[PDB]
Structure formats: structure tokens, C-alpha cells
Design a binder for this molecule. Sequence first.
Ligand SMILES: [Mg+2]
Ligand SMILES: [Mg+2]
Ligand SMILES: [Mg+2]
Ligand SMILES: [Mg+2]
Ligand SMILES: [Mg+2]
Ligand SMILES: [Mg+2]
Ligand SMILES: [Mg+2]
Ligand SMILES: [Mg+2]
Ligand SMILES: [Mg+2]
Ligand SMILES: [Mg+2]
Ligand SMILES: [Mg+2]
Ligand SMILES: [Mg+2]
Ligand SMILES: [Mg+2]
Ligand SMILES: [Mg+2]
Ligand SMILES: [Zn+2]
Lengths: 53, 216, 120, 114, 122
Amino acid sequence: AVPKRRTSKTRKNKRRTHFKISVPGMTECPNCGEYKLSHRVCKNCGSYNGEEV
Amino acid sequence: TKGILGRKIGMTQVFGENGELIPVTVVEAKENVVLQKKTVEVDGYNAIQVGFEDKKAYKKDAKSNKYANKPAEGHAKKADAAPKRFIREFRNVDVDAYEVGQEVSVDTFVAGDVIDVTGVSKGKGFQGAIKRHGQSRGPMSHGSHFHRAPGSVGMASDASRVFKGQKMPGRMGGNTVTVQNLEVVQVDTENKVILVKGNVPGPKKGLVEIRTSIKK
Amino acid sequence: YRKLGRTSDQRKAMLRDLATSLIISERIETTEARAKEVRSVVEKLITLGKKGDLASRRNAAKTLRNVEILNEDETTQTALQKLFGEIAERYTERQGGYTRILKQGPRRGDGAESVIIELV
Amino acid sequence: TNHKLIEAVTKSQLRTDLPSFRPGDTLRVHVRIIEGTRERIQVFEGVVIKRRGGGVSETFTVRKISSGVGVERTFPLHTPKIEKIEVKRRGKVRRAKLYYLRSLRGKAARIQEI
Amino acid sequence: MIQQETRLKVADNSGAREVLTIKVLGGSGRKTANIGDVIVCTVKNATPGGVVKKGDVVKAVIVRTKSGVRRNDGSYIKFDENACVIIRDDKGPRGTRIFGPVARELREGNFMKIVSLAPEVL
RNA sequence: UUGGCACCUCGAUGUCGGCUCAUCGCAUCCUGGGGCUGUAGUCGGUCCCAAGGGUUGGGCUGUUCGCCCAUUAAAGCGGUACGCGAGCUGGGUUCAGAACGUCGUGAGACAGUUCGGUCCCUAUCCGUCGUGGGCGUAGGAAAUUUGAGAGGAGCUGUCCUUAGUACGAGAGGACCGGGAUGGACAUACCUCUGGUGUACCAGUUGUCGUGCCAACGGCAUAGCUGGGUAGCUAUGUGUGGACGGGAUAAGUGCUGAAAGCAUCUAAGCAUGAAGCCCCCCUCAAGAUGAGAUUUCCCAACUUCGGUUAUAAGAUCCCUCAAAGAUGAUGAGGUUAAUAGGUUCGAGGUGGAAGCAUGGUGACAUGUGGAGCUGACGAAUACUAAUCGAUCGAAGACUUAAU
Ligand SMILES: [Mg+2]
Ligand SMILES: [Mg+2]
Ligand SMILES: [Mg+2]
Ligand SMILES: [Mg+2]
Ligand SMILES: [Mg+2]
Ligand SMILES: [Mg+2]
Ligand SMILES: [Mg+2]
Ligand SMILES: [Mg+2]
Ligand SMILES: [Mg+2]
Ligand SMILES: [Mg+2]
Ligand SMILES: [Mg+2]
Ligand SMILES: [Mg+2]
Ligand SMILES: [Mg+2]
Ligand SMILES: [Mg+2]
Ligand SMILES: [Zn+2]
């Protein structure tokens, strides 16, 4: 129910090994050359699959 | 002893000679080939490696298992066979009889043969102790705050621990299961189908390994 | 099918509203899960439209909401009329794939995947 | 259709001799019965309350009142046990399953002929 | 499916009209019985002047069940009611008349006298 | 067990019974193997070996017990904080109310009774059950594997035959052996029988809408009612504990001396249990002792130390389900049937709308097994799986052999 002992800084940091965010899945856009999320419309130019959206 | 690999098409029924209803599972055992033969001299045990179901040949930018990779294609090519989706060994079968690149046919099995069928059971996902271990529910009334819980997990100060193999909630299904002493009702050479009396483990489209019964 | 985090009645209503909205505007922005459920609903309405029979129009009337679309000519057309009129004519030669979805990326508020679904 | 392989294997089992009957039709069913060594045909006459399934797995249920007690017999449609089926009467019903008939008795259970 | 506390109508002229199942015979932990199974029962309701009396612990064989029985051919038989016959130790019926249809499964059980006395066997 | 003692705990170690879940001992309740018998046979009594598995439902009582009913092969006895209340209950007991008997002058009291009476807690650590990532396993990979270990399973009735034979005055009635079929339990699966089936079909009430009729929509538990596909399921359908082998216990011997005899033991040699080790089933090389087999990839630079991106390969991301909390796993990603749509079916529902006809009308009939249809089978690039990106070898030393 309650923690019997305090968590050391070491123990806490070990648990936070996997607590991280991944780099966004991004590719350079063909039309403009700005990075865009893959399988998503490019916000800068508004083009997907070489067609304006 | 004989072994063939197939997919579970589904279940049906067939009427026997006496008019008895026989529940059966339809298995398709097309495209079985002896990819490799293992011997005590080389591998330390005698078995035949059999590949079932052809897959597409290697392509440069294959992104799926539909197309064979270079390593698999080489192993199949050594047998002079097309790349196979599923490959399994049969130790029961005698090595001498079979030859590498030889097709294994449904006709090997005959009607009335007693067989043992192996397959991976259907997955149920995360399951509680009642479903998973056939445990009893607690009272559903009379002040009960115990319904589908696992019960006591141990004693008290003696042991002061949960023993290993305590039945608890966890993932259920996906286990390899062998049903023994099933029978072949019929073999269809034309459709490449074997009818097996009863039900076999796993989902439809699941690989089934049919072998001669070890117990005789 | 997807429950869409709503009760059965609320889901049905939302899908009817979404379908009607797509018919009126011919493009809408929504969450991915909602769009994937809508594509089936709208396309089945287009199928009824292309048939064009009274039974089809009465069956289509069930799903479609009672809305008025104002034309540039200032003529007033109901959504049901538009589906059985212009939209049916457009996709006469096409078998399926009346709608398409384009992913727009996450929105600020809830980080939900914003997508555009559009007829054609 | 159903799976093509399943249909092919069970196709032989299917019988074409059987007559076409709907639920609510009185049928006379001649069933081959074995009593000891002796084999004889015993006839069960009852309204068809239900028809379900398809292929070799298709079945029908016939309901009779025997000695003041209702009896229902479910037969596999393609069972070789049934010598023949005879449609004595064609009845008017508004549903596929006539489970309501189980509760009803006497005049209430009567079904109007087509 | 007959379990303890199940009440069955008695299809005979023994003098018992209704019985409650004290026990299902067949082994330890045996819970349910179907047609052709002997049960230990008490006479909850009895017709006057019968050989069997109310409050009598007696043995009976089940002749009809709502659950019914599945035959090997894949055919089924079901009844509208659950019924039993009060039987002697020899399996001979205590009563001299059996009422209503009885399953053929009784013949297998060697309850031949009940089968003969029965009006119809289905 | 009832006690003795007062050694831990009074800045709290929850107390009876039941439920859930067990686990262990064996002084064995059943089943297995034996010795003796006042062991004819069938049955028994007693003792020895044996813990593999099994060892029921009810009535009364808070009960534990016990008695009773009906079973069963049998209804074993104990330990585990009289196992188990951060798993459950709260009937008893052990607060405040009230009452009876009783005791007390009284306030009150009673291992006397009676009626009523608040059971908190979001798991930090170990432990346990599942499920991933990192690194290692002297190149990098894709598969197929061996099994050091480990877990699971392990139960029994009845009937027939042998045989009315052995045995017995008769009554009764074997072993050994060979079959058949159940009970309980375990597991797999949905063909069948059923259950469910809130995006399936139909009937129907009230009310409010779509201008009205007709036809529909909303709300009323899914409004209610009758059915029901897939999936998930038991009460449903299959299968299992088979047949054996090795070593043994209590036993039973063979040969045999010490001890001219005798002696199962001392040397030696057999036989002998549901038990042990196997056989059967599942997991398993982090088995750091990291195993094996098959196949794939194999170059340039360079300070000569080594580096490099790339290869084989695998991912990101995307369409998904047979998989799934999420990871993971599997099916696919245009050189494409992965999903949606479309087209055609299966199964389900049970006769759409419209129109016609008959009827005063409610309705009926025809068109027409009609119309509709989530998950199921097939087909079809119409839509979406775009374009891309990232990771990922070049193989240490020593010795022996060649
Ligand atoms: Mg319970
Ligand atoms: Mg509750
Ligand atoms: Mg505790
Ligand atoms: Mg002292
Ligand atoms: Mg303290
Ligand atoms: Mg002992
Ligand atoms: Mg205790
Ligand atoms: Mg209390
Ligand atoms: Mg008081
Ligand atoms: Mg006291
Ligand atoms: Mg089905
Ligand atoms: Mg209304
Ligand atoms: Mg109206
Ligand atoms: Mg309101
Ligand atoms: Zn761009």
C-alpha cells in the first residue's frame, strides 16, 4: 500500500531508463524539401504523393 | 510412421456407414516437400525436414514474408524445391524411405489410421484465474466482495512467500498442443485434403502437424 | 466495427451526422478512427444513390440527416437529393473507392490524429 | 459460399431425394430403427417447428404430441437413417422458428393449412 | 439433466404423483442424470390409495427429460416434461401401467418391462 | 489436546466458523504389493511396504464438532500464526440500546440468555504470474533443431467372458486371464445440441418529428417482443491417464559357507509395488557449460593502428488479424488482394417498397423464398498500404593438427 523505504536516486533513474520519447518518424518532403511525417500531408506545401492537397 | 504438414480449413461432419455422425476437421496438405534429411552422422539425430506451402521467390525489395529471403531460397534450392512458408522436422519417420526434394502426399496417410495432431492453440489474451485455471468464483451475494479473484496466494509467516507455479492471471492460449489417438476418416488426393475425426488445436488457417500415433 | 468511445445510439447518430457533413461539403477534417468508420457508411449511401430507385432513396433517407444545401443559383437542395443527383452521377463509372483519407498529423489539444476525408 | 474444400468433401454426403419442406408443414418421417437384430421403419409425424444450418450440417426438428406429452425429434437432414420424408400438410406461419407452439396446446397449437 | 432437488412427475399407477431427487446414482460426485438413469427419490405428492405413499424414499428410472438425449446418428429426442417410473430392485416397474412416451434408451438399460408397458417408445 | 512458564510483540503481531486457494507430513481412508490367520470359497481380522492419484451431496446448529439422510472405491488423520480478513464474509465472540432469569440497599453485574449493532488502505521492496527491451554467446544474418535441466499427467466403478468351473454338505462362489462401458478429472474445439450475440431481420406500444397520406427517423432499459450470423462459450463435441522397460520396497527364493547340519546372505544369482527412474505431454542453450545442422552476405580505404558505410538481413512508417493491455507475434505494403469499397455467395430473417386486386373497413392476396443483411467464402486495384529514412559484417590470440 505505502512505500516501506525511500527510493534511491539510483533506483529511480534505473526505472526511467525506458521512460523516453522516440524521434518523430519524419522524411524530407519531395516537393519542398522540408521534413514531413511519413504517410502524412506536408503542412508547409500541402502536398502528398506529389499531389497538392 | 508418416508425417504431413497442413492448414486447418475448418470443421464439418460426415455420415458413417451405419449412419453415425462423424465430426471432422478439414486439413489441406498440398505442397509438402522434403527440404532436408538429417542423420546421426551429421546432425546427431535422424529426421526429415519437410516444407509446406510454397511462397513467392526472392525479390530485391521484399517487405514481407510472402517473398522468400536469400538464405531461405538457398536452402530450398539445395532440395530443388520452391521456398516454403512452414518447415518442420519429423523424427518419427524413417530417414531411409524419404529422399530430399521428394513430395510428401496425403495418400501416405490412409483412412482408419490413428494419428497424433499438433498445433498452436487459439490465443485468448490476458485472462483471469477463473477462465485460465478453471477456478471457482466467490459468492455473488451475501455481502461478497470476492467474485473473480484468484483467492489466497499462500499461507502466512511460514513460507512468507508465494510458491513457484501459483496459478495466477496471465496470457492464455498460443500453447503447442498435441491431441493423440485421432483417426483419419477420409483422404482426398484430388483436393489434397485429409479428413480427421474430432477437432484439432488452433485457429483456422493454422499449421497442423499430422503424425502416426506414438502410442500403439 | 469500431465503438468510437460512444454508446450504440450515440455512435449511430454521429456516423449519420458525419456522413451528411461529407455529402454537404465533399470534404471534412476528423480523427482517423472516425473517418475509417465513415468511409463505409458514406460509400454505402453512394451505392444506394447510383441505384436511384425509390426503395434506395427511402433506405438512404434513414441514414442521411435532414439538412438543406444552398446552391450558387440560390436553389435549395436537400442532402438526399444531392446524393441521388450530382454525387451519383460523378461515381457512376467507378466501382467503390468513392472516398479517400489523407493523414494530417496530430492536433494540439489531445494529440489525436487529424485526417481529411473527401469524396473522390 | 462456404469454404470450397469443405463443400467438396461433404458434397457426396448431400442427398437430392429429400422433399422441399418449410417450417409449419406437417411431415411424416420414416426412420430406420434397429431393435436387437430386427430392423424396422418407424414413422414420426409432426409439424416442422425449426430448420437451421446448411450443407451436411443442416438439421430440422419435428414436433408431435404423444399420449398427452409433447415430443420433439431433431434429425440431420442428410442422415441416411431416414428412409423417406413425406409432406402431409403445408401450413401458414409468419416465422422460421415456431417455438411458440411448445407452450400452446390443443386448439391454440393448430396451424392453418396453405 | 436431473440433479438433487429436481422434482419429476411419475408416469405410472404406483400411487406416486411427484418425487424429489434425493440422489443420482452412478458414482462419487455424479451430479446430473438423463433418461435411463436410476435416481433415489422421495414421494412429495401421492395419489390416494396408492401402493407408494407420501414421504417414501424410493428408487426410480428416468423415462423422459426436457434436456433429452443425443443419438449416435446425430438425431435428438426431447420431451416437454421430465418423468420417471418408480422401480423395484429387479428394475421391474412397481406400477402396472406406464403413461406417456418413453425413450428407446431404456431398452439398452434393460428396463424391458417398462418398455413393454409403455404406450409408445420413441 | 488440556495445562505449566511469562521469553518476543501492549508508540496494535485482528480473534471463532465458513468461502477462495492451496501446500506439506504420514501414524494409509481407497486403490497397488506382501507376511500370518482361529485363511474351505466368497468375505474378513491383523501386521509389513507404499504418499502416485483419489478421498460426495444434503437436514439441524454461528458453529468447529456431532447426530441424521442418501451416496461412494473410499468419505484418512495432522502441520502450515488452530495456513489463508493490505484475498472475501462477519453468523459467534468482544463497545454504546433494550429485555428476561439471577445476584446486589444501590449505582450495576453474570464463560447465563434475548433482540439490534460502521471490516480502512491507489503495492515501494522481495515473492508469484504474464509480457518486452539491452548486452552477451569472437563476423554479420534467415531458418530448422539437440536436450543439461524443469514442469504436467498419474484416480477408479460396474458389467460380460473365463465359470456356475476352482472351493463347498449346502448355501454360496475365486484367483489368474480376456473384453465392454461408465463416474470424477484434464485438455482441445464449435460440426452438432444450446447460451450470448447494443452497427442482423421482423412484429408492436406511447409520444415527438420528416408539411400531409404512404413510408421512415428520434426517445421511452437495446422502449418492448420473436428469432439470429461470426466470435466467445458448456450444459455440447473429440481426446487423455495406453502398452511397456530398467532399478527397487515389504516380500519370496536359488546356490552357499562361517557353523560336517541348517541357513534367502556373508561371496554370488533371481524375482518382486498405483511407488523410483523412464516411457506420454509441454517448456527449455542467460545450459555465461551460451550447443548442432542447413543456407545467405564477403569491399574499399588506411597513419597499417584500424575505419567506413554498405551486403545478407532487419526495422521506422503504413494497411491489418488467425495475435494483442502495451510491447511482441503473424498477414501485407503496388513487381500488392492487407483492409475498406464494389460484385457474387454462405448463413440469418420470413415475404420490402411501390403497384395491382378483393373487402364497407380493419386487413388479405398477387407481383415474388421478396427485400434486407456486422464479423463468414470467393472475386475485383476503385480507395488506402506514397515518397522515403534508419540500423546492419569484413571476422582477437595461443597451441596442436593439416
Ligand atoms: Mg462456487
Ligand atoms: Mg459486487
Ligand atoms: Mg494476511
Ligand atoms: Mg522471570
Ligand atoms: Mg511500530
Ligand atoms: Mg509406512
Ligand atoms: Mg487461523
Ligand atoms: Mg455479529
Ligand atoms: Mg447496555
Ligand atoms: Mg463476559
Ligand atoms: Mg458456425
Ligand atoms: Mg415512433
Ligand atoms: Mg402516417
Ligand atoms: Mg426527453
Ligand atoms: Zn512539402
